[PDB]
Design an enzyme around this catalytic site. Structure first.
Site, PDB file in Angstrom:
ATOM      1  N   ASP A   1     -10.447  -5.587 -24.088  1.00  0.00           N
ATOM      2  CA  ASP A   1     -11.119  -6.309 -25.157  1.00  0.00           C
ATOM      3  C   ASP A   1     -11.702  -7.558 -24.541  1.00  0.00           C
ATOM      4  O   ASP A   1     -10.971  -8.407 -24.059  1.00  0.00           O
ATOM      5  CB  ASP A   1     -10.144  -6.724 -26.254  1.00  0.00           C
ATOM      6  CG  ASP A   1     -10.845  -7.109 -27.540  1.00  0.00           C
ATOM      7  OD1 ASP A   1     -12.090  -7.094 -27.583  1.00  0.00           O
ATOM      8  OD2 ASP A   1     -10.159  -7.419 -28.522  1.00  0.00           O
TER       9      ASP A   1
ATOM     10  N   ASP B   1     -11.316  -3.682 -32.237  1.00  0.00           N
ATOM     11  CA  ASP B   1     -12.679  -3.517 -31.744  1.00  0.00           C
ATOM     12  C   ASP B   1     -12.747  -2.401 -30.697  1.00  0.00           C
ATOM     13  O   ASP B   1     -13.382  -2.547 -29.654  1.00  0.00           O
ATOM     14  CB  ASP B   1     -13.195  -4.838 -31.150  1.00  0.00           C
ATOM     15  CG  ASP B   1     -14.716  -4.870 -31.025  1.00  0.00           C
ATOM     16  OD1 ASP B   1     -15.257  -5.855 -30.470  1.00  0.00           O
ATOM     17  OD2 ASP B   1     -15.362  -3.902 -31.484  1.00  0.00           O
TER      18      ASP B   1
ATOM     19  N   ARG C   1     -17.724   0.143 -25.317  1.00  0.00           N
ATOM     20  CA  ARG C   1     -17.996  -1.126 -24.648  1.00  0.00           C
ATOM     21  C   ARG C   1     -16.705  -1.870 -24.333  1.00  0.00           C
ATOM     22  O   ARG C   1     -16.686  -2.768 -23.505  1.00  0.00           O
ATOM     23  CB  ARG C   1     -18.909  -2.005 -25.518  1.00  0.00           C
ATOM     24  CG  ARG C   1     -18.307  -2.424 -26.865  1.00  0.00           C
ATOM     25  CD  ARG C   1     -19.284  -3.209 -27.772  1.00  0.00           C
ATOM     26  NE  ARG C   1     -18.699  -3.336 -29.107  1.00  0.00           N
ATOM     27  CZ  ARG C   1     -18.804  -2.419 -30.072  1.00  0.00           C
ATOM     28  NH1 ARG C   1     -19.493  -1.317 -29.872  1.00  0.00           N
ATOM     29  NH2 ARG C   1     -18.217  -2.617 -31.246  1.00  0.00           N
ATOM     30  N   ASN C   2     -15.631  -1.504 -25.019  1.00  0.00           N
ATOM     31  CA  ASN C   2     -14.330  -2.108 -24.763  1.00  0.00           C
ATOM     32  C   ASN C   2     -13.371  -1.186 -24.018  1.00  0.00           C
ATOM     33  O   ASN C   2     -12.157  -1.256 -24.190  1.00  0.00           O
ATOM     34  CB  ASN C   2     -13.711  -2.599 -26.080  1.00  0.00           C
ATOM     35  CG  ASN C   2     -14.222  -3.975 -26.473  1.00  0.00           C
ATOM     36  OD1 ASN C   2     -14.527  -4.797 -25.606  1.00  0.00           O
ATOM     37  ND2 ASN C   2     -14.330  -4.229 -27.767  1.00  0.00           N
TER      38      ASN C   2
ATOM     39  N   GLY D   1     -19.399 -10.769 -17.573  1.00  0.00           N
ATOM     40  CA  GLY D   1     -19.810 -10.867 -18.961  1.00  0.00           C
ATOM     41  C   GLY D   1     -19.568 -12.266 -19.486  1.00  0.00           C
ATOM     42  O   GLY D   1     -18.677 -12.939 -19.009  1.00  0.00           O
TER      43      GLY D   1
ATOM     44  N   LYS E   1     -10.789 -13.859 -16.716  1.00  0.00           N
ATOM     45  CA  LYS E   1     -11.385 -14.352 -17.952  1.00  0.00           C
ATOM     46  C   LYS E   1     -10.998 -15.818 -18.087  1.00  0.00           C
ATOM     47  O   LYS E   1      -9.826 -16.153 -18.258  1.00  0.00           O
ATOM     48  CB  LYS E   1     -10.894 -13.565 -19.177  1.00  0.00           C
ATOM     49  CG  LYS E   1     -11.539 -14.006 -20.494  1.00  0.00           C
ATOM     50  CD  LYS E   1     -10.821 -13.424 -21.741  1.00  0.00           C
ATOM     51  CE  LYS E   1     -11.004 -11.910 -21.861  1.00  0.00           C
ATOM     52  NZ  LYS E   1     -10.715 -11.340 -23.229  1.00  0.00           N
TER      53      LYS E   1
ATOM     54  N   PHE F   1     -18.013 -19.387 -25.248  1.00  0.00           N
ATOM     55  CA  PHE F   1     -16.934 -20.267 -24.810  1.00  0.00           C
ATOM     56  C   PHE F   1     -16.130 -19.695 -23.649  1.00  0.00           C
ATOM     57  O   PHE F   1     -15.240 -20.377 -23.104  1.00  0.00           O
ATOM     58  CB  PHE F   1     -15.982 -20.534 -25.959  1.00  0.00           C
ATOM     59  CG  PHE F   1     -16.629 -21.208 -27.127  1.00  0.00           C
ATOM     60  CD1 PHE F   1     -17.184 -22.474 -26.987  1.00  0.00           C
ATOM     61  CD2 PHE F   1     -16.646 -20.594 -28.370  1.00  0.00           C
ATOM     62  CE1 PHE F   1     -17.750 -23.132 -28.076  1.00  0.00           C
ATOM     63  CE2 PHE F   1     -17.209 -21.239 -29.476  1.00  0.00           C
ATOM     64  CZ  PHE F   1     -17.759 -22.510 -29.322  1.00  0.00           C
ATOM     65  N   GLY F   2     -16.443 -18.448 -23.291  1.00  0.00           N
ATOM     66  CA  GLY F   2     -15.728 -17.793 -22.213  1.00  0.00           C
ATOM     67  C   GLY F   2     -16.557 -16.782 -21.450  1.00  0.00           C
ATOM     68  O   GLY F   2     -17.630 -16.382 -21.875  1.00  0.00           O
TER      69      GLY F   2
HETATM   70  C1  LIG Z   1     -10.200 -10.655 -16.769  1.00  0.00           C
HETATM   71  C2  LIG Z   1      -9.797  -9.960 -18.083  1.00  0.00           C
HETATM   72  C3  LIG Z   1      -8.828 -10.620 -18.967  1.00  0.00           C
HETATM   73  C4  LIG Z   1      -8.422  -9.973 -20.214  1.00  0.00           C
HETATM   74  C5  LIG Z   1      -8.991  -8.668 -20.570  1.00  0.00           C
HETATM   75  C6  LIG Z   1      -8.638  -7.917 -21.808  1.00  0.00           C
HETATM   76  O1  LIG Z   1      -8.997  -6.747 -21.914  1.00  0.00           O
HETATM   77  N1  LIG Z   1      -7.905  -8.582 -22.738  1.00  0.00           N
HETATM   78  C7  LIG Z   1      -7.228  -8.012 -23.864  1.00  0.00           C
HETATM   79  C8  LIG Z   1      -6.921  -8.852 -24.991  1.00  0.00           C
HETATM   80  C9  LIG Z   1      -6.239  -8.294 -26.143  1.00  0.00           C
HETATM   81  C10 LIG Z   1      -5.856  -6.889 -26.196  1.00  0.00           C
HETATM   82  C11 LIG Z   1      -5.131  -6.376 -27.485  1.00  0.00           C
HETATM   83  N2  LIG Z   1      -5.558  -7.023 -28.735  1.00  0.00           N
HETATM   84  C12 LIG Z   1      -6.968  -6.690 -29.147  1.00  0.00           C
HETATM   85  C13 LIG Z   1      -7.401  -7.571 -30.368  1.00  0.00           C
HETATM   86  N3  LIG Z   1      -6.499  -7.322 -31.532  1.00  0.00           N
HETATM   87  C14 LIG Z   1      -6.971  -8.003 -32.749  1.00  0.00           C
HETATM   88  C15 LIG Z   1      -5.035  -7.593 -31.194  1.00  0.00           C
HETATM   89  C16 LIG Z   1      -4.571  -6.853 -29.867  1.00  0.00           C
HETATM   90  C17 LIG Z   1      -6.176  -6.022 -25.029  1.00  0.00           C
HETATM   91  C18 LIG Z   1      -5.843  -4.515 -24.938  1.00  0.00           C
HETATM   92  F1  LIG Z   1      -6.095  -4.000 -23.736  1.00  0.00           F
HETATM   93  F2  LIG Z   1      -4.540  -4.323 -25.157  1.00  0.00           F
HETATM   94  F3  LIG Z   1      -6.584  -3.850 -25.819  1.00  0.00           F
HETATM   95  C19 LIG Z   1      -6.845  -6.611 -23.913  1.00  0.00           C
HETATM   96  C20 LIG Z   1      -9.944  -8.043 -19.682  1.00  0.00           C
HETATM   97  C21 LIG Z   1     -10.351  -8.643 -18.472  1.00  0.00           C
HETATM   98  C22 LIG Z   1     -11.312  -7.881 -17.674  1.00  0.00           C
HETATM   99  C23 LIG Z   1     -11.969  -7.203 -16.934  1.00  0.00           C
HETATM  100  C24 LIG Z   1     -12.610  -6.385 -16.025  1.00  0.00           C
HETATM  101  C25 LIG Z   1     -11.993  -5.723 -15.003  1.00  0.00           C
HETATM  102  N4  LIG Z   1     -12.907  -4.982 -14.278  1.00  0.00           N
HETATM  103  C26 LIG Z   1     -14.074  -5.187 -14.861  1.00  0.00           C
HETATM  104  C27 LIG Z   1     -15.412  -4.721 -14.608  1.00  0.00           C
HETATM  105  C28 LIG Z   1     -16.444  -5.159 -15.453  1.00  0.00           C
HETATM  106  C29 LIG Z   1     -16.142  -6.070 -16.550  1.00  0.00           C
HETATM  107  N5  LIG Z   1     -14.918  -6.549 -16.848  1.00  0.00           N
HETATM  108  N6  LIG Z   1     -13.940  -6.086 -15.991  1.00  0.00           N
END
Ligand SMILES: Cc1ccc(C(=O)Nc2ccc(CN3CCN(C)CC3)c(C(F)(F)F)c2)cc1C#Cc1cnc2cccnn12
Length: 297
Positions: free
Chosen positions: A174, A156, A160-161, A32, A56, A36-37
């Site tokens: 996310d 969010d 999709r998340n 995805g 990511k 910027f990322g």
């Molecule tokens: C490489 C990677 C890096 C980071 C993240 C990520 O989810 N980051 C994340 C950032 C913040 C928060 C919590 N906040 C939300 C906002 N909020 C305002 C504050 C709190 C959470 C949460 F899980 F806790 F929700 C997660 C996912 C991936 C992925 C992937 C992946 C793995 N298999 C597949 C297959 C297909 C596609 N993608 N994929």
């Protein structure tokens, strides 16, 4: 207590124990991308042997602002720890190249596309069936219950998340920077922001407050996505002055056809205009537990 504080991610520690040799990462296809990322599939060596992971990373276009966001993200995942129903952090490469975050790879991808891919196979009450949907409903509430217990607000939450991996285990995630929200019409300009309005609680929409209880409302909309097998919420209904008017009045979605009655009652309660009458995620986990047992045999 917890209604009056929040974690400021820029105030969390970054432990360098996460730092991983970036030349032990080999990058593959993009999963995805945003401006910027992007999130790419990758191979990592000696991380825990060769293993598939997701990464990511910042694009070359990225500014300090996005780097900060990604570093805060890293700190939050570290803070959250590694759990069954949330995407697990494995490592990071924050210097000597593009800043990136390494997590587990979820082999079935994001839940929304999965549900869409599986809609036609659905066995009414391998293929999907009702206990799959209940299982996902349970696992997402459970993951969110944990997030709430850590005083983490998602903002969010939607299909999709959520990612799906081995054994049909769901992982809340996310995509943040690595989603192209300009060309995703589920994000709607609202002021100086494109926001997931159809998923948002009224108080968030009108008052820009995000709380434990506003996440519960989105979970309700998620339930509707789930039991509607990936349909877009409020079908035939564009976000505009009228849509805003109608949510404020008490307009709500009718049950998806595949939702058991108790699951739809949960949705409706998630959608109460009074944030204080919505269930907590702890409560939802209980109710769904019971449903799953009742629906078995
Ligand atoms: C490489 C990677 C890096 C980071 C993240 C990520 O989810 N980051 C994340 C950032 C913040 C928060 C919590 N906040 C939300 C906002 N909020 C305002 C504050 C709190 C959470 C949460 F899980 F806790 F929700 C997660 C996912 C991936 C992925 C992937 C992946 C793995 N298999 C597949 C297959 C297909 C596609 N993608 N994929």
């Amino acid at each position: 207590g917890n209604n009056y504080v929040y974690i400021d991610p820029t105030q969390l520690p970054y432990d360098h124990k996460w730092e991983f040799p970036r030349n032990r990462l080999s990058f593959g296809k993009t999963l995805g991308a945003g401006a910027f990322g992007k999130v790419v599939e990758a191979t990592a060596y000696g991380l825990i042997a060769a293993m598939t992971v997701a990464v990511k990373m910042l694009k070359p276009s990225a500014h300090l602002t996005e780097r900060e966001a990604l570093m805060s993200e890293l700190k939050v995942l570290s803070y959250l720890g590694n759990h069954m129903n949330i995407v697990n952090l494995l490592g990071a490469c924050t210097i000597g190249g593009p800043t990136l975050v390494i997590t587990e790879y979820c082999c079935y991808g994001d839940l929304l596309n999965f549900l869409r891919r599986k809609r036609d196979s659905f066995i009414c009450s391998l293929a999907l069936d009702l206990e799959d949907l209940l299982s996902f409903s349970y696992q997402v509430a459970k993951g969110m219950a944990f997030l709430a217990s850590k005083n983490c607000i998602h903002r969010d939450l939607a299909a999709r998340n959520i990612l799906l991996t081995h054994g049909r285990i769901t992982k809340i995630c996310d995509f943040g920077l690595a989603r192209d929200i300009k060309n995703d019409s589920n994000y709607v300009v609202k002021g100086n922001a494109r926001l997931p309005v159809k998923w948002m609680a009224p108080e968030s929409i009108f008052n820009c407050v995000y709380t434990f209880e506003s996440d519960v409302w989105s979970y309700g909309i998620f339930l509707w996505e789930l039991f509607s097998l990936g349909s877009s919420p409020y079908p035939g209904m564009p976000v505009d002055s009228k849509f805003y008017k109608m949510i404020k009045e008490g307009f709500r979605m009718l049950s998806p056809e595949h939702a058991p009655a108790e699951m739809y009652d949960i949705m409706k309660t998630c959608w109460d205009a009074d944030p204080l009458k919505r269930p907590t995620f702890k409560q939802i986990v209980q109710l769904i537990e019971k449903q799953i047992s009742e629906s078995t045999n």
